[PDB]
Amino acid sequence: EIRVAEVADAGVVAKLLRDFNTEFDTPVPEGLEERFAQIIAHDDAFVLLAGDIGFAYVTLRPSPYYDGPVAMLDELYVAPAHRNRGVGTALLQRVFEEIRKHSAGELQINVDEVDTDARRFYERHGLTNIEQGSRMLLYIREL
Amino acid sequence: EIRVAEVADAGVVAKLLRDFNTEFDTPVPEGLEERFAQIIAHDDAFVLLAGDIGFAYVTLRPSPYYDGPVAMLDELYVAPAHRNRGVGTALLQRVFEEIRKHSAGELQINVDEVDTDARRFYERHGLTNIEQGSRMLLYIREL
Ligand SMILES: CC(=O)NCCNC(=O)CCNC(=O)[C@H](O)C(C)(C)COP(=O)(O)OP(=O)(O)OC[C@H]1O[C@@H](n2cnc3c(N)ncnc32)[C@H](O)[C@@H]1OP(=O)(O)O
Ligand SMILES: CC(=O)NCCNC(=O)CCNC(=O)[C@H](O)C(C)(C)COP(=O)(O)OP(=O)(O)OC[C@H]1O[C@@H](n2cnc3c(N)ncnc32)[C@H](O)[C@@H]1OP(=O)(O)O
Ligand SMILES: CN[C@@H]1[C@@H](O)[C@@H](O[C@@H]2[C@@H](O)[C@H](O[C@H]3O[C@H]([C@@H](C)NC)CC[C@H]3N)[C@@H](N)C[C@H]2N)OC[C@]1(C)O
Numbered sequence: 001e002i003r004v005a006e007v008a009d010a011g012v013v014a015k016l017l018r019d020f021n022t023e024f025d026t027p028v029p030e031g032l033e034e035r036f037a038q039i040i041a042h043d044d045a046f047v048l049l050a051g052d053i054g055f056a057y058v059t060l061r062p063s064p065y066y067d068g069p070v071a072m073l074d075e076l077y078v079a080p081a082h083r084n085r086g087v088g089t090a091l092l093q094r095v096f097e098e099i100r101k102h103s104a105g106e107l108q109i110n111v112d113e114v115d116t117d118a119r120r121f122y123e124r125h126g127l128t129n130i131e132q133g134s135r136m137l138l139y140i141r142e143l
Numbered sequence: 144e145i146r147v148a149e150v151a152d153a154g155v156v157a158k159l160l161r162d163f164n165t166e167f168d169t170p171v172p173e174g175l176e177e178r179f180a181q182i183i184a185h186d187d188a189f190v191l192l193a194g195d196i197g198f199a200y201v202t203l204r205p206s207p208y209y210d211g212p213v214a215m216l217d218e219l220y221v222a223p224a225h226r227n228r229g230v231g232t233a234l235l236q237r238v239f240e241e242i243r244k245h246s247a248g249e250l251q252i253n254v255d256e257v258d259t260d261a262r263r264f265y266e267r268h269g270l271t272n273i274e275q276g277s278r279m280l281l282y283i284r285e286l
Contacts, residue, residue: 017207035207043205044187059204061215062182064160065172072204100286107284114277127282132169134257138279139270141250143243
């Protein structure tokens, strides 16, 4: 079932994020668990857990366009053996439900162009890459 | 010079954002001044002003990857008569300075693909759309 993570669940969330990065051959910094414990307790952010096999990490930030925040689904992951059985759909549905309790004006998600399965999933569940007739790109600088 | 906006500057910020959205024929929400006054008073966002002719609006949000926030340059605009003279460069250099005071681990920016001149500007100043050989895309749902 989906539930909202408590501070004491930080270790499970961190493990799943580590698994996600390992799946993508990306090294992870130390301290994921300690940071997730802090974020879950104190910040305008939440984590949803599907048992111990999937999670969603959402941040809520201010926007002049809305009375409520703009939400970002910063991380969404289901463990590979549990995919294609509706877990990601359930997590994303619960994301929409939870951000609606905050009157969020919009949900954003960053995705690599090459991740066509994720893109297909998001496009089939109501998200779009198009604004004013153009694709939207994410630019970053790591610091 | 460039300055960090105060609550008293909400009117000038709101005017500039209205002008930006009018130029690009994108919608303008009601209540921009009052919302900016609220946003500027809080700890997780700031606006930089170049006189009354340009602005940067930055939000800060938590990440498990860093002790500091992830910053997002949600809006960057210079009035048309003042472009191509280095104002945008100065604003972006002050964005990096200010987010360094917060120990931000990354800067992110949403950029329409069609905005080729803005994209050249960001690439010239150290931002990248590429991660592991793939372009990064933004997906949204308005709510
Ligand atoms: C090539 C490439 O890109 N590789 C990427 C490899 N790794 C990653 O990207 C890592 C991160 N990604 C993830 O962790 C996971 O991918 C995700 C992104 C979180 C997804 O989480 P789940 O797999 O749990 O999601 P789901 O099961 O809820 O839905 C997924 C698909 O299941 C089928 N389905 C489910 N329910 C039903 C139903 N009731 N009726 C009919 N069909 C159904 C349907 O076909 C659907 O596909 P469609 O997208 O709607 O067309
Ligand atoms: C978060 C967010 O909202 N992101 C979107 C960015 N916002 C916009 O697109 C709104 C409209 N544009 C501006 O608001 C401002 O123009 C910018 C984008 C902040 C830059 O400010 P400046 O004009 O002050 O720049 P600059 O003088 O420091 O450096 C000069 C270099 O700017 C580029 N440049 C000049 N003129 C335009 C132009 N009309 N359109 C697009 N690019 C332009 C060009 O690349 C030039 O380079 P080149 O010489 O032609 O090679
Ligand atoms: C409806 N969603 C948008 C979101 O995608 C996001 O839009 C960005 C927004 O942060 C920012 O938009 C500005 O730049 C846009 C222009 C330069 N391209 C048309 C015009 C609208 C103007 N507000 C640009 N960085 C790119 C634009 N797609 O932020 C505002 C929003 C209302 O939440």
